[PDB]
Design a binder for this molecule. Structure first.
Ligand SMILES: Nc1nc2c(ncn2[C@@H]2O[C@H](COP(=O)(O)OP(=O)(O)O)[C@@H](O)[C@H]2O)c(=O)[nH]1
Ligand SMILES: Nc1nc2c(ncn2[C@@H]2O[C@H](COP(=O)(O)OP(=O)(O)O)[C@@H](O)[C@H]2O)c(=O)[nH]1
Lengths: 255, 255
């Protein structure tokens, strides 16, 4: 298969994962060279499986989980404001389960003042369950978990709490930085998938050289790409993932 | 060159950079297969050019610079305690030039209470120059800069301040996470080298799959590897870089 082999080779060189590089290489068997120009991005975008801004339209209890310094707190704040700009701040509340960082409550509490929404800290499961029922009238409750290394033995503590009691449904979104090595991102995914994840938030596109590995990991892991962030400005440096745009960007190396 | 080619190929597969992979491949021309077992790690360790714990023995004004969430504040605190455990806390002082983060002073100020050392915030250059002369009797002054994306247009602001006035010498150390893609780390290096750097701090070895790319970037950029961090525990999760150990770890893929 002459064309299939060149495509795959180039896709690997452009930092796509072996699995995705093959799947994309494969459509050279169903398309014209010319059709392929549009078919490559379109297939990649499709695979990334974006679900609009589900947080905003759907609400509910949403938790951000992920390894250290990826931007969970920053992306949480962006989401809060987003939801509040439609709807209203009286409909948003914030929780942190991070009793590690030097005064995590204070950072998040300060965002609360800025954005006009209550902020509570859960020290354990019982308290989290109280706070969530207490906030039942809120349309969006955002939970900020503690950043930990994906192989940290404490990890399950932060994670299993979000999936305990089958009558508080919680949608957990994995926050990953697009700067990470492909294998690190995959390692993170594998360990964090200890609980069901509803999608991924991809941060630091403004620091990234290439999105190919990051996008590949999401494809491979069957994680929808929900939102992207591209700077430090709260709240505007967040977008609903436009997967076609992202696909195009990632494939521009080949061109 | 049969052996040279296989070595390079394997080294590339183990995620070493083209430049370093070639240099290491090259010593198969000067060593026995058996001598090579020890010569590979030894050459790689040599290239990483560690300078003991220079901060501790030497002191002076030390600044940590680097992109977002890499662990500048956390590594600063570790260094402070290290210096204080030898010598004393009355010999250490802390400065932050980060007037961006929601109350950066408070985090660092809280470490100050913990570790028994004064903490000041510089809002501009003049104030930094005052604070440093004010702290002239301190043997170590540690400066925590604001984390920014390596291509952030504000970057020079944080950086040029550390190199203004040729009568306050400051040693800047680049803090980089070992989780980052090789090309991102290199991109970071290139932009941060807008000022002279004295070395690198390599963080999050406990989150890393492989050190090969990270080590390669330091080699290529001629940046000494000063310290490594391998967890979130302040202050003990920091070591002087044992380059031979690191070299061995990075090369164990080939085995
Ligand atoms: N350049 C860039 N920096 C970001 C982005 N998101 C977060 N950051 C920074 O990454 C650092 C970590 O932010 P934080 O929300 O506390 O990460 P967390 O520890 O997971 O909660 C901070 O310096 C943020 O400003 C992004 O999209 N682009
Ligand atoms: N697993 C691991 N996490 C680290 C390490 N160093 C810092 N972190 C975490 O990375 C996050 C960023 O810490 P911080 O010092 O504020 O990074 P900064 O924004 O550059 O100052 C925090 O959650 C730290 O706990 C490390 O060596 N290993």
């Amino acid at each position: 298969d002459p064309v299939g082999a060149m495509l795959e080779s180039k896709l690997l060189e452009a930092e796509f994962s072996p699995a995705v590089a093959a799947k994309l290489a494969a459509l050279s068997q169903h398309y014209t060279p010319a059709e392929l120009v549009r078919a490559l991005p379109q297939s990649l975008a499709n695979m990334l499986d974006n679900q609009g801004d589900d947080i905003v339209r759907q609400g509910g209890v949403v938790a951000l989980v992920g390894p250290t310094g990826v931007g969970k707190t920053t992306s949480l704040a962006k989401l809060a404001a987003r939801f509040a700009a439609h709807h209203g701040p009286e409909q948003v509340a914030l929780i942190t389960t991070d009793h590690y960082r030097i005064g995590a409550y204070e950072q998040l509490a300060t965002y609360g003042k800025i954005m006009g929404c209550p902020v509570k800290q859960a020290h354990d499961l019982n308290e989290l369950e109280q706070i969530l029922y207490q906030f039942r009238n809120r349309k969006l409750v955002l939970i900020d978990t503690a950043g930990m290394g994906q192989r940290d033995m404490r990890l399950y503590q932060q994670l299993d709490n979000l999936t305990a009691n089958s009558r508080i449904p919680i949608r957990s979104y994995l926050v990953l930085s697009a700067t990470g090595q492909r294998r690190v991102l995959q390692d993170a995914v594998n360990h964090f998938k200890r609980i069901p994840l509803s999608g991924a938030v991809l941060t630091k596109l403004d620091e990234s050289v290439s999105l190919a590995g990051a996008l590949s990991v999401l494809i491979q892991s069957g994680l929808p790409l929900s939102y992207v962030t591209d700077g430090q400005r709260v709240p505007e440096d967040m977008k609903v993932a436009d997967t076609l745009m992202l696909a195009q960007q990632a494939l521009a190396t080949l061109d």
